[PDB]
């Protein structure tokens, strides 16, 4: 109506699809480190990253090896095909935290430590399950003995 | 029997228009912003446009549709590489969702600067106006 | 065996299992109805797939609230297990 | 490094679905016994679950 | 040409892997996640039918 949108206003961000188009290893180690921060190590690899100052800095640094595409939050939501009322924050909270490489750990030794602890806690789950069963059985037997005494 | 899907839901855009109507055509020219050079799309670009990730065997029906099926309709087993590809697609979805969530959280906290670019880009590129105030 | 899109009916069964896990028991029951129809048409009598889908359908009925229907379906499942030969230990336990 | 392979663990709850089914059935039986107030039944069913 | 100008949304198509793959009940106001966490989590092939 040739006037400003008469309603509550919502801020909408952007998401960058970054595709590596040149051999990253042929450049200086700073460029390769920025690409790895963008999660790129080989030509033909594509990644999805947030539109934030740090990501913008990295893409600006490596703009001659990276081709960028933009997707507003609305466009990304339409692309994935989810209801508009659902929030990417809700989706993130729902999805598991141990999906893949949980986090970039300081060193592969620490990564091996993390995997070892994952397996150790997996085993401890069953160990504690059995131990709790034993404890409940012991409590039931103690109660039965008390009742028999009474 | 045979299968032919371009979308997960199996829906497809109307391919054949009404009789006697002028049909829609794709953009033969490349997606380059500048009017020149005026180059036609490459075969790989056409593959990207039609959905295959540049190669016949990367994405699309040739990658998502089972290559065989028992005559009585029983489907095929889940290969290790099939499960790995499904995990890769889920990983792409997770990356997208996590990036969107990070952007939303930054917006809520108030970290998204009102200025277009970073200091380096701003002092390198004249196209960004001056936001001093 | 007659041809049946067992791939599509398996998609429906997986969707029904997801509905069960999500608590949408009516939707799970609706999907299991189609899956059971397809399995009944496709597989022969007293078949492992048929008894399994009947188990799932009985569970869906019980969760929705049709306790009598669930009891009847599970009783028929037990009858089919008795009639069959070398039934799966996991299947009979479930 | 890469010593998680020396401790690789596979859960029986995942690699034997019959075991998980029976464990759940015994848990439900124990709950039913507790609700009813029975003691011997709960003790025997829990002990059998532990033995499994 | 090896200098192709196509959108990277095309480079990574999301047509056959929509959100419903991991959130099957999303369209019905139910946010249940069933995502294949890692290739490491692969119990192996399993027969669809006994026949």
């Amino acid at each position: 109506a040739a006037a400003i949108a008469p309603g509550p206003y919502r801020r909408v961000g952007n998401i960058f699809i970054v595709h590596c188009d040149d051999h990253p290893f042929k450049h200086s180690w700073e460029v390769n480190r920025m690409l790895r921060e963008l999660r790129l190590e080989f030509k033909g690899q594509t990644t999805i990253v947030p539109d934030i100052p740090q990501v913008r800095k990295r893409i600006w640094r490596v703009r001659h090896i990276v081709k960028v595409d933009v997707l507003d939050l609305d466009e990304a939501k339409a692309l994935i095909g989810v209801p508009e009322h659902i929030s990417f924050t809700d989706l993130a909270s729902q999805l598991p935290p141990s999906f893949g490489r949980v986090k970039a750990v300081p060193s592969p030794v620490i990564r091996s430590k993390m995997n070892f602890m994952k397996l150790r806690r997996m085993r401890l789950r069953d160990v504690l399950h059995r131990d709790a069963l034993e404890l409940r059985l012991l409590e039931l037997k103690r109660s039965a003995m008390k009742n028999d005494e009474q | 029997y045979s299968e032919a899907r371009s979308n997960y839901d199996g829906t497809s855009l109307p391919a054949w228009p009404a009789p006697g109507k002028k049909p829609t055509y794709p953009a033969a020219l490349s997606e380059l912003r500048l009017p020149q050079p005026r180059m036609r799309k490459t075969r790989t670009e056409w593959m990207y446009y039609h959905g295959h990730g540049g190669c016949p065997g990367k994405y699309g029906p040739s990658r998502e549709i089972a290559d065989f099926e028992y005559a009585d309709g029983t489907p095929a087993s889940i290969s290790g590489r099939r499960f790995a590809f499904k995990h890769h697609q889920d990983h792409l979805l997770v990356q997208l969702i996590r990036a969107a969530a990070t952007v939303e959280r930054y917006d809520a906290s108030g970290l998204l600067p009102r200025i277009p670019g970073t200091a380096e880009q701003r002092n390198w590129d004249p196209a960004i106006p001056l936001f001093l105030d | 065996r007659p041809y049946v899109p067992l791939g599509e009916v398996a998609k429906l069964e997986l969707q029904g299992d997801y509905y069960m896990e999500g608590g949408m028991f009516q939707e799970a029951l609706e999907h299991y109805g189609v899956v059971a129809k397809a399995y009944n048409y496709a597989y022969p009598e007293n078949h492992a797939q048929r008894i399994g889908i009947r188990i799932k359908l009985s569970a869906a009925f019980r969760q929705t609230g049709r306790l009598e229907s669930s009891l009847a379906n599970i009783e028929e499942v037990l009858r089919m297990l008795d009639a069959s030969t070398r039934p799966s230990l996991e299947l009979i336990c479930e | 490094y890469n010593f998680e392979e020396k401790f690789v663990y596979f859960s029986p709850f995942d690699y034997d679905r019959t075991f998980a089914l029976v464990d759940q059935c015994l848990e439900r039986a124990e709950t039913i016994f507790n609700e009813i107030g029975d003691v011997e039944g709960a003790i025997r069913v829990l002990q059998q679950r532990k033995e499994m | 040409r090896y200098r192709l100008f196509h959108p990277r949304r095309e480079a990574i198509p999301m047509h056959m892997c929509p959100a419903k793959t991991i959130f099957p009940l999303i369209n019905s106001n139910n946010l249940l996640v069933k995502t294949r966490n890692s290739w490491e989590d692969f119990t192996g092939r399993k027969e669809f039918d006994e026949d």
Binding site: E41, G44, R101 | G80, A84, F85 | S88 | - | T43, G44, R45
Partner: peptide
């Protein structure tokens, strides 16, 4: 090196992937 798995990775074959035949009740 360190792997990011930003690209498709084929799952490594492992003995835990053996097709386990389900236990069947005896025929007698």
């Amino acid at each position: 090196v360190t792997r990011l798995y930003t690209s498709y990775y084929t799952g490594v074959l492992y003995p835990n992937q053996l097709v386990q035949p389900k236990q069947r009740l005896p025929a007698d």
